[model samples]
Target: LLRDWKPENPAFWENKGKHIARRNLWISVSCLLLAFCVWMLFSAVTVNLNKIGFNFTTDQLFLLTALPSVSGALLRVPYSFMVPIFGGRRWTVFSTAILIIPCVWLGIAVQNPNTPFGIFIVIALLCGFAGANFASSMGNISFFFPKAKQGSALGINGGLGNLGVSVMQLVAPLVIFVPVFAFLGVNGVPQADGSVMSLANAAWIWVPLLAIATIAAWSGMNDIALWLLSLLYLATFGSFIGFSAGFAMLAKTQFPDVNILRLAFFGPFIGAIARSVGGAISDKFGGVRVTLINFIFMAIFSALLFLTLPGTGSGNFIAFYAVFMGLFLTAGLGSGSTFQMIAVIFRQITIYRVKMKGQAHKEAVTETAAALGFISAIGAVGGFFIPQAFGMSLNMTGSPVGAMKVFLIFYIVCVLLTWLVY
Candidate 1:
């Protein structure tokens, strides 16, 4: 609906652009929040699936937990492209609608004892489409705002958007296990027998809300052109790298005074808050330069962890916390910087990809949305691999720091790559 929009122009932004962009930002946040919740539902719900008489093994349950993440990760590339083809509002409506398939199917399929494992797997796989919403939503929001504000805008969007995992972790248990309203039914499906509990409610709780968000997006938002990349690879992946970065066992065994289990949140907490800082700084300094610097620091800290930290002793926790937290800070900054880079980099590209065969160029930034999806799809793989690498390092080398060393080498590569490309 907004045409010839220019956020850089003070008068235009003050009169119309700011309000419209703010409205879209919150809606995109809400949609993204729900998408994250849905995408992560299986992580919470699958653990309890055994109680419903569906008897899956530890391995099978693990596969089910991984299904949504895999599907969501792969789908991001295509989802990024959809906003350009269909428009942000239309794609958002469609993408959120697809969420119903996973929600409703999981709700219905769980109740029937005959429901095959493969069917649940397929439905769970569909839940990942919600994960792809981040790419589209981030891309869409990027186009609405000007380059100057994107770091803060996207930091709030993605940083808080990630809380979907935390929120789902808190809320899903209550809805599934607790008897809030035994008398009420979700979508006409009666409540389960008490004590043993029902997980169908987990999938059902978000259905009505998703319907509302989808409608709001369809009616309330607009498409101009769309939108992302680097902190993602380094900062976020490094955050995940730092997150399960595997010190819990050492916490109890080596430094029980303040174990990683109790203190792990500080890393992510710092990362989350620092995420905004990375964006704002990159907005000022330039994402490529910021990201390159962050990688160098990340590499430095990773080396510190590898070389200086005691493998087993009294000095472990201090060395570990100081260096590990530094990694987290750099990662968060990298995440913010890289995100800002995507907007700046794309906007400055020689060939604007927004135009079709016969149409004049619609907007320079529109292509940024699809670019975000493509980059996000690639970036998300780090989430999967970082954890796997840590696990592999534990298995092969008998120490998690082995993986940390590998990450150091990778960061060096990123530094070279950043210089080469940017």
Candidate 2:
């Protein structure tokens, strides 16, 4: 709908562009935040499913947690292309509105223990639609900012958006204990400890919030990458999302005596804040330098994670928790730095190529935007793979050591790749 967008022009940006850009960015960030809350709803819900009388196996529970990411990652491919085709504002409203289906269904399904596992699976996949929003949201925001400020702008949008995971995780647990919706005739399951938990509250709580976000989109909003960039994203954003999806479940399985849900939100919280910081720092010192160093820390954190596990009773929960937090920090930092790298690298490449053709600068912007979206889609796959890998490793070997080993090696490879290529 914006006809004369030229953020790169100093005159246009100072007077007309900055205000509209900020408005769209904030609205986009709000919608994306709600989307993430929906996307990771199952991460909180799955852990409580069995407690509410559903007799699912551990692997099945893990699948529920991982399914959203699977569909989300896949949906990002098409979602990446949608902004330019459909218009960002229209697409954001539509994408955000559709998320209500899963939230309502999930609320109903949890209230009745007789609901089929297949129904939950479908709902889980539907939640991925929220995940898909990230691709378009990021691409849309890219069009609003000049290249010089894009890193911090994108970082703020992404970091705040990513915070939804921590917000949901933190809020869901407490909200389930309160009868916030009891006035609506929702019932709570009485626990043996004289406490009550309304698991339906977790899903239903997001309904009104989603409605508000969607309305905001209706009233306010507007709305990538290549293959090699995908690999780096897979290592960074992928790890952040993957770990966010799986951390609680992993901790519960490994350290059963420790109640992990209370602390689970902290990892994502650290990562999200670090992501914003990463982008700002990358802007100052250069993304390649920040990213290379980040990978080294990631590799170290991954290696340290192996020793913290409770293998043969030698495992320490404190150590394990600390190491995983370290991973989260590095993952978040890497995500920001890598994204900064992507914006700079793709812009440079596209400008150089178009220079050979004597084309306008607009061509470079379009190509770079497309590259950002495409690469983001690929990076999202890490969310699916990480949880699934943990599930499989536990199913096969009764320990997560194998998956940890694989992650450590991947980080090492990322280090070398960043060093040699960048």
Candidate 3:
């Protein structure tokens, strides 16, 4: 585990730190790819479930899908604390290892229609571990790069990690397709009653890949005093994934009878790619100003959604995508800006300490590095909340408008919060 993080410490950094950072970066990417893969796993298998033998309802399907997200969001705060308890490398390896349980049980659940619903919920929730990687990964990465370069690097890291979801979509089709073709080729595509055959075999496709990721972290990556960085990660990781689930959940509920539901995902897809630019642009300009703008956009879009969700048909799609995608892009950019601003703000604080108390740069950097963990933990609560609010709204009012109302309230608070943080 990283005892103290001051990449500027020349002797330690040049000799041992850079490689450690790169190794952790790759490990984090591996976990993210797995996260997205497992996340979409439900989407892939549901189509085949009925064909295979299972006749699950839509609610069951969505619950299976949402379970991981909920668990992951809930786990972020505790997981942030884990790095300090177990050390980053140890926890990463352990966390990656835990994925095997979900993959195997998922394979079983899909194959055996009789698998209990309670067990499935537990297994699906296990997938949330994949989501928690964002906090740990970013916190780990931030320690390696100098504050000046972290904005660009973190943005790239965030963008690439998000890019993993699209990758999973493309890969899930191929993973299931190839195995089904080779094993269940001829009559395999169709059931006796003409319903399409369910390919439970696809669920096992990611098991080996997840194993490789765990092994990589075990052998190559370094752990950190990760608890300290949780807070900073809470801020960065929370908004990104919180809204990742947010946009998707909103699409299914808010516009149940839309003209083009799939198109709504365009917002998340757009946000994923733009995250890198969020960093690049934030690096070019000041991050605080950018983050403030992002909060404003978020508030505006949430209001727009509130106003227009009552509309129906093609216009709903237009308005939904317009607001959803715009909110995502704005948030994506703000993510980078916020991280950069944090770094700069800390730098000034460090300077103040050094000048006033004759403190060493290393000491100041060490303390600030630890603060990142706290920030990540607090911010990540957003992920847990986004879906819950919608769920509550749906349960109570039979519409997501209540949830959108809550979001408007939160957005305002966040705007004020952003100003306070800056």
Best by lDDT: 2
- Most TM-score-accurate candidate: 2
Off by over 4 Å in 1: 2-9, 50-57, 108-116, 181-197, 225-235, 238-271, 283-331, 349-363, 386-422
Write the candidate numbers in order of decreasing lDDT. Answer: 2, 1, 3
Across residues 1-422, which tens digit of lDDT does each residue of candidate 3 receive?
45776566666667766667666777777876676666545544543455455666545544555566666656654665565567657777777777777777776676666666787778767777666766566655665666555555566666777776655545554444344433533223554555444354455667778788878877776755333323433444455656665445456555556523235345556767766677667766665677667778777886877655655334365677677677777666665566555655666677686667664455544445455545544555665666556666666567777667777776677777767756
Report the lDDT tens digits of candidate 2 across residue range 299-351.
Answer: 99888777776664477999988988898999998888788788778888778
Please give, for residues 254-281, the per-residue lDDT of candidate 1 as tens digits.
3545623335546655665666667777
Question: What local distance difference test score does each model get?
Answer: 0.65, 0.84, 0.61
Show where candidate 3 strays beyond 4 Å: 1-24, 39-70, 77-91, 147-151, 173-202, 218-239, 254-266, 307-315, 354-360, 364-366, 416-422
The candidates, ranked best first by TM-score, are: 2, 3, 1
Model 2: CA > 4 A from native: 6-11, 222-226, 357-359
Better of 1 and 2 by TM-score: 2
Could you tell me how far off, in angstroms, the CA of residue 128 lies in candidate 3 after the best superposition? 1.9
Residue 177 error, candidate 3, Å: 5.3
Scored by lDDT, model 3 comes in at 0.61
How much is 147 displaced in model 3, in angstroms? Answer: 4.4
Give the local distance difference test score of model 1.
Answer: 0.65
What TM-score should be assigned to candidate 3? 0.76
